[model samples]
Target chain A: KPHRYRPGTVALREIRRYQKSTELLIRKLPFQRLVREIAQDFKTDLRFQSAAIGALQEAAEAFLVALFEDTNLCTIHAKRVTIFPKDIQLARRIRGER
Target chain B: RGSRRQIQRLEQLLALYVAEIRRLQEKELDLSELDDPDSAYLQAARLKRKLIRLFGRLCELKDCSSLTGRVIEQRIPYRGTRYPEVNRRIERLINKPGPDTFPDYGDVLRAVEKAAARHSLGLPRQQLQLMAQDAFRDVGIRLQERRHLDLIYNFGCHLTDDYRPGVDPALSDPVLARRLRENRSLAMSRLDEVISKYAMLQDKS
Candidate 1:
């Protein structure tokens, strides 16, 4: 079926294409080990708890994503093709992590 | 076609503004007069705010709202007399020589200034000098941090004796391994992001 606003093509194929590409770029990691280490760092005895791991994983991923984004910005500002050591340092400085 | 040309022009202007902001920030780090703590902070604050506004404008022009999320808020705190040892260590690390793989900080400044002048940005030479100073300082900080992280990683390896193939020393002490892994991952991932982002800025076609 065509769109109501004089469109000859359907939106379903376009939507599926977008979704497929987005899914392809999504990253997967070993969340179990990540959560376990985080728990150990905090001296928490909560091990093998799916709920706890899920929460912690979400927080960790969020933090990492933000850091990654800032690092990219720093690299671009430096006008470099490679993210040198200084890029990560500058990223931390920008994020006030230092 | 006209819109494309206009966007390119905006990109050039945006680049100039970004460079100027970086230059100002580096200078802010070097100001250490005992009587005027506020002076450096205030100048940095103003330039940072201006940069933020310029960034927003650039995003609008580029039709890339996603990039606007990367804009960071500037918070230049007053540097009190403390951690002299740590400061000295960082200073030494930055000064340690290696192959100058990165673009010269001076060259970047000159390019930005030339662009600004061509486009009638009216930035003063004195202002550029101050910005260059700050930019140089920032480069030093980056070099210092890079060295510091390398030292820490090496120390971890030395302590663990994990250099042997398939030794898996990190497994022996999960906590230490986790810390080392986390720091390394953070640094590496950020570097990857930077490389990809820089690629995006370049003309692929």
Candidate 2:
């Protein structure tokens, strides 16, 4: 039987991929612990409102590079992960630092 | 194709705006030249509000950009643009060998205001530009974080909405969809978490 829409199309696959990542994270620490880590980190480290944005752009680019450079993951998850935006704002902000 | 091109243009515009934010911040640090502390604080506060508003607008535009299904490609704008010159300047500054003679925010503001006054007195454009650029280089380190944080928050929102809708964000148990509606704490916490993670990862990586 043909379904009107695929249960696990590109979008659904992505949803599951993140879901797995989240589950792995959840297993390592309670949801509250994860939340606490984030809160504390933001208050102390990310307090510099405008400056923090550049750092984030760097992280996003690295995440993509790492994601794509893995050939196996690229072949299997490429279609799913490729939708995420590639950002270089952070890289541009720092410019010279690694 | 047109929409994609429009987004690219928008990204460029936003990047320039980010540079403007840095400019304002550098001016804030230039404040120490004011003899009156109250006067300096007042001027800094005024610029601070403007910076926040500009930063807020950038975030809003980024949200709008993603809504239209455009992928934002991020890159540092000034990297390698004048690599040799910048490297030489850095080497000179480092070799100066003074203690970390970091000026207060007010010092930066006063220096900038002084240059502006000199410009009014018909100071050379070449001199003014060099002064402004030097002031900017001091605060660039601070401003860099702001742009990156904005990118991280925007990316997190884009990721959660696009890849994991209906799933709870790492910051909270509420899915972004539900948290986005009228729940300020949930929404802000989620964003804050995403921003924090990116900040830490940046430091380590």
Candidate 3:
């Protein structure tokens, strides 16, 4: 079976266009879904405050930037073109990630 | 005595002392106070008192009168006083590397115990150990984290090739060499001040 948003499809093309044209399009959508899923999994009627989504997005981006920078250093240290799982693990450890 | 427990206790005290010194060293003074001599002097006095207290505690742990008595006699020399002889001695001591910089807990314990025995105080080994540990614990969780960061920072100076002989480009340039030496002297002075302060505290209470 084909993916829901197949290549060249309107949905896929629109998402790509939105991603290229605007930062806001992809900023919080996945984060919102993850938050909703987590909330649902806990069977809670808790609602995110208006700023919560933005805060999460900002934190996530910051974390990713730090993680990737550390990861890149690890890759360079190992003198490898492709980043390995061990490299990522070391990177995470350096960044004090779980 | 080379008892494991005694060494452990001394190590605990030293750890706590270094941790406290680092905490105080990193403490930020109020910037506004610098503009006013009255406030600045007050702040300076407050810091001096705290350092004296810290030194006193270290002296008690180490059981040494030499460090504490010397400071009292000298009356804490000013930075630019015509005391080149004393300053040179300090410079030599600070630059002298090896076990002296990172003291052996065994030696510290022996000294403390000997001092206690002299006065017939005869503090029990277990009691001393507990007290030392308690002192360290009082500083709380941040102590270990702070120590870890400090170790990383100090050792990180040698992380690059620039610190190595010949590899350092600064060696070829007199200006850079002089600058580096000056900075190193400043760093050494800061370290000496802390050690000397602690030593000053080591006296008869």
Candidate 4:
């Protein structure tokens, strides 16, 4: 085995694409399915109104962006420009998230 | 401690600490107020930064590569403790080196008991052991998730290079048992600080 120094990049278009996609609420579709998955898994049928879905989708997206920013700082602290998987792990632990 | 190499190593550690603290400031990381915490909250946030600076000043006047190391010593330095026999026995278990022959809680119990009897500021046995248990678990869960490399690096902690875990079966496994002991002491610092001086005097002779 070899030692890992974990040399790690920010691609501009990637962030732009994510931002552009969020305008159309593209993640709402996936989240709708996710909500259904949880509901069914719980042996119950649940439905969401448009307002609830929009609020949740936006909140989740904002939460992710906040987390990404935190993880980026963590990556920088480690002296790496690229955010490694471990950075996310560290960030979440710092945030004390579930 | 007077050697150039040792001084240089401590310098390197301080440089890293500065970089980490600056990054935290850049991110504007908000720290919750004074409260219940393990070392998880001991990052270069506001409160800790002040102490680190104060410690750095005092450390410059004498031999101390380990600002908090001395605290960990006055508190619990693991390998180098008041009771070498207990720590030595624990190290032997970790150093034997093989496949996943994890050390048990009894090892901690025996070690803690042996040390507690010989010397201390006079902590009750049950509370001390429970403190160890809590800190041990706190460190374990963090390592298990493969997180807190910052903690490992900044604290000058020891974690074996081999067989690192994905989710951290934690320290229940020998693979990370080495980490469980050494790193747990750092977390235990928080638990140690929790024992107010008033309580210590009450418990004292």
Candidate 5:
């Protein structure tokens, strides 16, 4: 089972394409149903709180990896909170504007 | 015979003098009225002296006797002035350890009790004493909590490089950050511990 955080971008499109091909070969089922089934299967097997922390961390780490991987720019010092480094720069600039 | 005659003569002469003084005093007009200025002033002075003596006796008997059994009441300090420094110190002490700080829980508690005893209201002397004891025990724990939080905040400020980037890299490194987070979490846990202690007491059986 594969999970992509906030599946709204280029990575999600690629993962959804892979899911469709895998389902067509096996169950002839719709891709969304297959994904929902996969989610249910993992939900019962994982311990509740540990699974939640893992999910949140995966989402955070994935977002960071995607931003750096897509941009091809790695700095020695990742900003203190790197989830949205550009947002931070914009915030600073806005404050400076005042 | 001459010695006996001399003693008798002296006794008779003394009795006659006293009688003559008494007769002259009786004939003199009783000019001093009950409401006379001098008499009234003297009466007020006497009452004031009597009350003062009664108050002295009350103080001497305070421990062994009840308020009702005492002739005069012990005065309470004016509430506003009584614990000015104490309330201020407790407010500070409960919040954090400071440079000019008291040493331990017992010292803080004793200071609080001393303040309460000085300023407590028309409560019985025994009840006032009991209040002093209870204040030390109950408020002492609260003061400890505040001190713990103050330490956490100080450590947090020391640990974070997010707010101040160019600080000592050694002090604000990853290990320091981790230590600060743990300190903050521990402080939070202690907060729950203190609150739970109070909540459990309030729970009805």
Candidate 6:
């Protein structure tokens, strides 16, 4: 009923609370509306299959979660745990923000 | 006894470690080993190697991209040059004024720091900070969502500007309309304070 042992029990117990509930982490719009807008922005009439769009959606969400994480770590890099926008700024910079 | 305390503790830990991880307080980790003699430099390198190994292992597992699945990796430019735009937007949003009803960001930081100091018990700062980071990393929806209402309501008390509401918002109440307005006003005030003041605190550095 418990995860196996690790270091820093108080810390691990609390952090693991966040870590274990992993699942789809973002919004997925239906009807290709998101991609419809994207294609419009790209200024092309090229069409997308539903599968490619789905992958695109997944890829986008993955990017978001990754950013959320790295940015939170940026907070961890600071002196306070409460998050600030600069932490997000710093996180993207670490990834070269390119 | 309650999750408010639990969350406060977690938050405290997070704040503490934000610096600890960066600085690597030379004296803290020695608490566990009680060593006769071992260089923290060596220990630190080993810890880093473990993390590097973790990345290697994760690659070996090749966890699927969330939601869409059926993918080994998902690395791309990820909107490279556009980020500073978001950064600019972040500044705009963060700097935007909160509703008149809300407390200031300095007030929020003061209140949180006050609570943290109260519970400090005169212990080393790193102990509390590291504990918080650990919890922050593992925090689950259950603790957050389960405690959501009470935790949020507790925030309003620090508002020197507004009257503390006697009644918590009731979704099932007979007068959903009045409750909805009350909820909105309260949330509007709270959200304003959270964003503007949080931004305010960050720049104080």
Task: Score chain B of each candidate by TM-score.
Answer: 0.26, 0.20, 0.22, 0.24, 0.25, 0.18
The TM-score values for the models, in the order shown, are 0.24, 0.19, 0.24, 0.24, 0.20, 0.28
Prediction RMSDs, each to the true structure:
23.8, 25.0, 30.5, 24.4, 42.7, 27.5
lDDT of 6 by residue, B1-205 (tens): 2244554554455444333322331333222222212333223223334433332233233332111111111111111112233223223322332111112223322333344565554534454445334433333222223233322332211111254455544545759868788888897677556545756778897
Candidate 5 positional error at B182, Å: 18
Model 2 quality (TM-score): 0.19
Candidate 5 vs. true structure, TM-score: 0.20
What total of clashing residue pairs does each candidate reach?
A: 3, 33, 3, 3, 0, 17
Over the stretch B71-140, how does candidate 1's per-residue lDDT look in tens digits? 1111122121133332332233334333221334544356446545665666677665555446545654
Candidate 1 lDDT at A68 equals 56
Candidate with the greatest lDDT versus the true structure: 1
Q: What C-alpha lDDT values do all the predictions have?
A: 0.41, 0.35, 0.38, 0.40, 0.35, 0.37
Instruction: Find the candidate with the highest TM-score and give its number.
Output: 6
| Tens digit per residue, CA lDDT, model 3, B25-47 | 33333333222334322332333
Comparing 4 and 6 by TM-score, which wins? 6
Candidates 2 and 5 compared: the better one by TM-score is 5
Give lDDT tens digits, candidate 2, residues B1-205: 1254554565465445334434433332121222233432233334334433433344354443211111122222332213334433333332232112223223333444454564454545455445535544544443334334534443322213456544546346456646466576676666556645666666675
In terms of lDDT, the poorest run of 10 residues in model 3 chain A is A2-11
Off by over 4 Å in 2: A1-98, B1-119, B124-130, B157-205
DockQ of 2: 0.03
True contacts kept of each: 0.00, 0.00, 0.00, 0.00, 0.00, 0.04
Candidate closer to the true structure by DockQ (higher is better), 3 or 6: 6
- For candidate 6, the per-residue lDDT at B2 reads 23
Q: By summed lDDT, which 10 consecutive residues of candidate 5 chain B come out lowest? A: B69-78
Compute the lDDT for candidate 3: 0.38
- DockQ scores of all models, one per candidate: 0.03, 0.03, 0.01, 0.02, 0.00, 0.03
